Amino acid sequence: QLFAEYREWHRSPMGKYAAECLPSLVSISGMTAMHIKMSPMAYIAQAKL
Amino acid sequence: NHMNVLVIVDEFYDNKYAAPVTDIALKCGLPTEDFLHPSNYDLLRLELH
């Protein structure tokens, strides 16, 4: 009644990446980088950079 | 008309809805890998010198 893993923003692979990565600058950079959506605007903004 | 800069700061953002950006900042935002792409034709056709 509290947490539907399918219908959720932060699914289980991001939890695995959180639990497995070493705490570093580059891991913070990665976890910001994986918050990008699969939207066509995200594809456009990723093509431009 | 008057030498009061404070109201000049106030009377511009007075719940300002439309925020139009200039072409120059939109030029220098994007890098060179997409500036020559034909999607950026309007920014390219006024960069002639």
């Binding site: 066509p40 605007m41 456009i44 | 034909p38 999607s39």
Partner: peptide
């Protein structure tokens, strides 16, 4: 319609055409 138009504007709206 506006997001569809922005998408169609920021991409392209023998040559050997290639799929992906």
């Amino acid at each position: 319609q506006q997001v569809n138009d922005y998408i169609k504007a920021k991409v392209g709206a023998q040559q050997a055409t290639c799929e992906i």
